[PDB]
Amino acid sequence: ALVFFAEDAAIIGLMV
Amino acid sequence: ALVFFAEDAAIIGLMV
Amino acid sequence: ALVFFAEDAAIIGLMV
Amino acid sequence: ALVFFAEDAAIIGLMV
Amino acid sequence: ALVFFAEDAAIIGLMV
Amino acid sequence: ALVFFAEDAAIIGLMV
Amino acid sequence: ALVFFAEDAAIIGLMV
Amino acid sequence: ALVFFAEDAAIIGLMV
Amino acid sequence: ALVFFAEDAAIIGLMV
Amino acid sequence: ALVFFAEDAAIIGLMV
Amino acid sequence: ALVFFAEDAAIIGLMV
Amino acid sequence: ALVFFAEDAAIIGLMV
């Protein structure tokens, strides 16, 4: 699965 | 909101 | 075109 | 992370 | 299917 | 434009 | 609702 | 950034 | 496949 | 139009 | 929730 | 990368 990154602060992973 | 990153060059934020 | 990034390991581009 | 809502009935969260 | 909601005014369903 | 809603806390609009 | 357009050939609407 | 187009009526831009 | 269009400037296709 | 598939049970089409 | 399928190899579910 | 499937006919891959 791919992991995208976003600033939520702190950077968080978004797993797909 | 979430801020994603993309190369547009320069790295820009993409807010959601 | 925009280029997003994801961890796939190694970081890969994703062009739009 | 954002939580979107959808009817699945009952309403469910969708966490991003 | 999932039914999301959006303001279009009136709140409409968006089926998936 | 459509306006979607998400919990972010508090509920926020997301315009499209 | 929003109507996007795409070539499918022929150009079609895509309603959201 | 990319600018997509949709009928909303009138044709509007959608900037990404 | 579907071909969407966006201004990038110049109008480009985006194939799906 | 493209038709994607999802388990909803039973597998359903999703046309685009 | 809908389950989409993708090849990651092996087929994996993607739950929405 | 992930490869999704859609009916386009024939079943085609859609790589991400």
Residue numbers in the entry:
A (entry chain C), B (entry chain B), C (entry chain A), D (entry chain C), E (entry chain B), F (entry chain A), ...: 1 to 16
Could you pull the original sentences from the published paper?
Amyloid-β (Aβ) forms heterogeneous oligomers, which are implicated in the pathogenesis of Alzheimer’s disease (AD). Peptides Aβm17–36 and Aβm17–35 mimic two different β-hairpins that Aβ can form, the Aβ17–36 and Aβ17–35 β-hairpins, respectively. These hairpins are similar in composition but differ in hairpin alignment, altering the facial arrangements of the side chains of the residues that they contain. Aβm17–36 and Aβm17–35 are cyclic hexadecapeptides consisting of two heptapeptide β-strands (Aβ17–23 and Aβ30–36 or Aβ29–35) connected by two δ-linked ornithine turn units that promote a β-hairpin-like conformation.
